[PDB]
């Protein structure tokens, strides 16, 4: 099976990968923001939206990954091996979940169409030589609805 | 935050806990069954349903967990240590995903109300002394 | 005072005693089932029914008994004596609570008349020689108002 | 499961625990009084009331605890050991049942509203410095 | 800034000082009583009254004072001395909070006017020589021509 | 009892916790600001507002805490142990009172809704990577 978690939301893994890793907040800061803005909906008995359903699973999945990675660290006897697991998590699944958590949080706040336009706008800006581009980054909020019955 | 992945679907972690671990198919068999029955919908650009959205994420999350567990597992020198990872996965996160994958697959096939009733029916049957209960288990599809 | 806990529910200790101890689920499984089926009602501020009121007390009483039995076991010097406490609890008060919890859970699920008939049906079946009786046991399944 | 035995009766464990242990009659005296006032109803085939149903179970539960504690005591050779069991029962589960038996007996005699008001009145009186408060305690039957 | 916590409630520190320390229940007993009588209101999202707002803060402030003293005691010296040195909280600020907690609880129960008059009545009684005064203290809760206008 | 001092004002401890500690002025600067802006109201015989009542108690509570912390500090002139008192205050109760004093002062000046929106705006801004966000912080007074 070949499932792209962005495809039902009108995006792709390749489109999120257009952004450099430095664009994304940390996982902990994304999780804090999801709580600050959406805790009640995420904890509610209501689906709310496909974005809420996906964001719930992504939050819990990161917890699963951290529980496994922590248990692995607990059994490692070499301090350099423990560093290897951390660096493996941060370099691989960490970036994947920063992309994913950011995508759902930003879509819930600003809308898919605005988010996809911002992804392109920032990705083009950061690829322009710094001496040739505007000094500040484009701003997500400065950019210019199905009811999901079941 | 305290998110119960079953709550938006009318269930709870505690309710799935009512079933013994032996009730659930293996993760591999659950994944094979999701593919055999729902591959086209799971891979489509349509949400289809909240169960599809959740099942998509659970399938991908298990992939993430297995890539990590395999990467650790292939690099261990002691077979007692590899048995420790396998036994840790099977006893903990493996059981969580058997519950979760089974819940979404069964709901996609039979509907929430049938699944919740079956959860209780089987959990009650298996707790009845074997000499006092019907020889065969209750059947999910019947009702 | 001589109170039979079944009497207000149309039964007696002697009638529950007609069933062999192997008939009843374990206490842990009865408690799990009470939660799976009746957690919200048992925890609610409403009486719900006389069975709910009695089942609430039985659940908490089992907790009291286990706290006492656990405390006794930890403080006994002789480990063989600790084993005897466990076996004494299981053979005596444990069986009493399996009967009691089963009675209220079954009554809430199937009603008093079905339960009382089933207790006699199973009690008669298990006393029939196995070679002379049906191979499978009888099946139990095959908001009320409460007067006094 | 988290069951508060007072909740269906409009009270809580925390409210009963507002009263110091010395407020409550002994378990033996509560059982004597339950018999003197309510023996026929408690032994009858009728529910009578939710308080009667709960009080029946509380009386029998204390019997279970005493049967267990007595069996333990008869099997302990050391008197100091038997003394500690007696003191443990009275200090812990004994207080729980003094609260519980008193609550049901008082409610059957005076009604829940009167009982709850009295709990607060006595709990406030006993917390007032003795030199600053009325010499006698408030009276349950008044008002 | 010189804030008297009683001034907005029609009293002063000097007036509460008229009562001897023996008059007041203990802090623990005042806190137990606030819960027994006012837990739901104190925990609610409604202001309820100025007395409720002030009492909420006093309860939490006592917690702050005890948390600090306990944390220091846990990391001061070995336990032989650490507990009794920080029993200063009870020795000084303990009376201040007994006054303050009692003031808010009594006002919520009986009203400011009854409380202030009772403060004076008890303070006068306790200052009268015991051999010359009534044996029992005045009572906080205390105080037929309605037939004519029948 | 579980009292959240923000709850009657439409907030929670966890919401204030969304802000980094560096966001808040010092306690001393919050107190000097409360005096410059609200000394007369805070010292008046009128309630003025629920925020005034709460802020009065918080100001006085900090006085209680510092008298205690100084008495604790003055007793043992061992630098490590002394530096633990100030470091415990700075990391724990000092931060609690910076949050609380700021919340009441900002609410008195700009209103609850402006304050709550600003908390989220700044908390989100500071979590955006510095190279990707506007160079200056959002401004509390700008609606
Ligand atoms: C809600 O409980 C029930 O419904 C029960 C059923 C439901 N039955 C379970 C079964 F598999 F045997 C078939 C089914 C039926 O009667 O159709 N059966 C029984 C018993 N049967 C024989 C000895 S105890 N007890 C409970 C009350 C029971 C209570 C607690 C427990 F853990 C197990 C069973
Ligand atoms: C699409 O899935 C199903 O339909 C399933 C059926 C369908 N049933 C399989 C059966 F042979 F037991 C009879 C049939 C029925 O109820 O008529 N049964 C079950 C379970 N039954 C007992 C424990 S798990 N799970 C799934 C969801 C299930 C899911 C994944 C898997 F690998 C196996 C079963
Ligand atoms: C394993 O042994 C026991 O269970 C027992 C021992 C073990 N004792 C040690 C021994 F080996 F010398 C034989 C026996 C004895 O004193 O005769 N002693 C007793 C006593 N009853 C009255 C006075 S002592 N009861 C139990 C059954 C007893 C039962 C429950 C309990 F909690 C404590 C003791
Ligand atoms: C709700 O609190 C009260 O009602 C109180 C009463 C109620 N009175 C208790 C009494 F027994 F003395 C008689 C009764 C009355 O006035 O009729 N009395 C008092 C005090 N009286 C003297 C010194 S403190 N304080 C509180 C506020 C009080 C507050 C907390 C506490 F723990 C004890 C008393
Ligand atoms: C039937 O029970 C009662 O009526 C009771 C009365 C009746 N009062 C006994 C009295 F002497 F104090 C006067 C009388 C009254 O209120 O007029 N009082 C009390 C208590 N009062 C204070 C602490 S417990 N409990 C019971 C429920 C009570 C229950 C069991 C028991 F053993 C003792 C008291
Ligand atoms: C609710 O989230 C947002 O509103 C977000 C904003 C809001 N913007 C933050 C800002 F300071 F850069 C200005 C403001 C705006 O667009 O006006 N911006 C961004 C990003 N911008 C650049 C790289 S990520 N992400 C989130 C979804 C974001 C998500 C989580 C997180 F922790 C930080 C930011
Ligand atoms: C009355 O207090 C205020 O008005 C405040 C202003 C007023 N702002 C100060 C400024 F220079 F940043 C611009 C101005 C504005 O929003 O236009 N800003 C802030 C904060 N801003 C960011 C972190 S705290 N807090 C207070 C409540 C504040 C409270 C106490 C204190 F000491 C400093 C600031
Ligand atoms: Cl794809």
From TrEMBL, chain C:
<keyword id="KW-1163">Viral penetration into host nucleus</keyword>
<dbReference type="GO" id="GO:0005198">
    <property type="term" value="F:structural molecule activity"/>
</dbReference>
<dbReference type="GO" id="GO:0075521">
    <property type="term" value="P:microtubule-dependent intracellular transport of viral material towards nucleus"/>
</dbReference>
<keyword id="KW-0946">Virion</keyword>
<keyword id="KW-1160">Virus entry into host cell</keyword>
<comment type="similarity">
    <text>Belongs to the orthohepadnavirus core antigen family.</text>
</comment>
<comment type="function">
    <text>Self assembles to form an icosahedral capsid. Most capsids appear to be large particles with an icosahedral symmetry of T=4 and consist of 240 copies of capsid protein, though a fraction forms smaller T=3 particles consisting of 180 capsid proteins. Entering capsids are transported along microtubules to the nucleus. Phosphorylation of the capsid is thought to induce exposure of nuclear localization signal in the C-terminal portion of the capsid protein that allows binding to the nuclear pore complex via the importin (karyopherin-) alpha and beta.</text>
</comment>
<dbReference type="GO" id="GO:0003677">
    <property type="term" value="F:DNA binding"/>
</dbReference>
<dbReference type="GO" id="GO:0046718">
    <property type="term" value="P:symbiont entry into host cell"/>
</dbReference>
<keyword id="KW-0167">Capsid protein</keyword>
<keyword id="KW-1035">Host cytoplasm</keyword>
<comment type="subunit">
    <text>Homodimerizes, then multimerizes. Interacts with cytosol exposed regions of viral L glycoprotein present in the reticulum-to-Golgi compartment. Interacts with human FLNB. Phosphorylated form interacts with host importin alpha; this interaction depends on the exposure of the NLS, which itself depends upon genome maturation and/or phosphorylation of the capsid protein. Interacts with host NUP153.</text>
</comment>
<keyword id="KW-0238">DNA-binding</keyword>
<dbReference type="GO" id="GO:0003723">
    <property type="term" value="F:RNA binding"/>
</dbReference>
<dbReference type="GO" id="GO:0075732">
    <property type="term" value="P:viral penetration into host nucleus"/>
</dbReference>
<dbReference type="GO" id="GO:0043657">
    <property type="term" value="C:host cell"/>
</dbReference>
<keyword id="KW-1176">Cytoplasmic inwards viral transport</keyword>
<keyword id="KW-0945">Host-virus interaction</keyword>
<keyword id="KW-1177">Microtubular inwards viral transport</keyword>
<keyword id="KW-1144">T=4 icosahedral capsid protein</keyword>
<keyword id="KW-0694">RNA-binding</keyword>
<keyword id="KW-0597">Phosphoprotein</keyword>
<keyword id="KW-0677">Repeat</keyword>
<dbReference type="GO" id="GO:0030430">
    <property type="term" value="C:host cell cytoplasm"/>
</dbReference>
<dbReference type="GO" id="GO:0039619">
    <property type="term" value="C:T=4 icosahedral viral capsid"/>
</dbReference>
<protein>
    <recommendedName>
        <fullName>Capsid protein</fullName>
    </recommendedName>
</protein>
